[PDB]
Design a protein around this ligand. Structure first.
Ligand SMILES: CCCCCCCCCCCCCCCCC[C@@H](O)O[C@H](CO[C@H](O)CCCCCCCCCCCCCCC)COP(=O)(O)OCC[N+](C)(C)C
Ligand SMILES: CCCCCCCC/C=C\CCCCCCCC(=O)O[C@H](COC(=O)CCCCCCC/C=C/CCCCCCCC)COP(=O)(O)OCCN
Lengths: 69, 83
């Protein structure tokens, strides 16, 4: 029965080790992402949460019919 | 050719007001694109000095900017006097 239907314990053991590593990495990545989102939303210095401002390319820098703009 | 002929005949006989209106509208639409004077009107509008012409700081590298109004450089309105 053991020869025909199953494997040794080392296979399940090391598959479990691989599964555990994947899951623990995913967990720490999730926590880190939550912290990064908190900081990027509070500070606005990150690539995320960039709210539009006015394009400076719309300003007209030509003499404006009076000297003081 | 002969369908539209009798059609314009019946229209001139029954609704001359609409005939004249469509003729005048079509002329107003198409004639301005064939005229040599539309550019003259654009240029006349561009030659009207509404605001003060602010002078440029001379850097020694402006051969085509006048240093006094009566100097020969700059735009000329001679074409306008003869128009
Ligand atoms: C000797 C007599 C006295 C003792 C009798 C012993 C009793 C044993 C017989 C009972 C059958 C066991 C039930 C089957 C459960 C096993 C299912 C599965 O685990 O088996 C697969 C293997 O497949 C097997 O073939 C299971 C198929 C059994 C299907 C049972 C169907 C019987 C129906 C009877 C119909 C008869 C004719 C009908 C006439 C109308 C494993 O997949 P595998 O990917 O390898 O895993 C890797 C393991 N390696 C490395 C060892 C290869
Ligand atoms: C491309 C030019 C566009 C700009 C110019 C037009 C600006 C304004 C003129 C258009 C105003 C709207 C016109 C609305 C048309 C109404 C048609 C209609 O139903 O009236 C008909 C009357 O007119 C008709 O017969 C239907 C259309 C017949 C042709 C009308 C003119 C079509 C174009 C004719 C001239 C073509 C171009 C000019 C060439 C001139 C020749 C060199 C029925 O008369 P009733 O009032 O109901 O009579 C009640 C009592 N029995």
């Amino acid at each position: 029965i053991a020869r025909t239907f199953y494997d040794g314990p080392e296979k399940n053991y090391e598959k479990t080790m691989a599964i555990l590593q994947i899951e623990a990495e995913k967990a720490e990545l999730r926590l880190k992402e939550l912290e990064v989102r908190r900081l990027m939303r509070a500070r606005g210095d990150g690539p995320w949460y960039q709210y539009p401002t006015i394009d400076k390319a719309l300003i007209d820098h030509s003499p404006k019919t009076t000297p003081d703009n | 050719a002969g369908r539209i002929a009798s059609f314009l005949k019946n229209a001139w006989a029954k609704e001359p007001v609409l005939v004249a209106s469509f003729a005048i509208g079509g002329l107003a639409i198409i004639l301005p694109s064939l005229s040599p004077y539309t550019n003259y009107a654009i240029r006349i509008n561009r030659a009207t000095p509404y605001n003060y012409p602010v002078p440029l700081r001379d850097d020694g590298n402006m051969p085509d900017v006048p240093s006094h109004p009566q100097d020969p450089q700059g735009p000329s309105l001679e074409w306008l006097k003869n128009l």
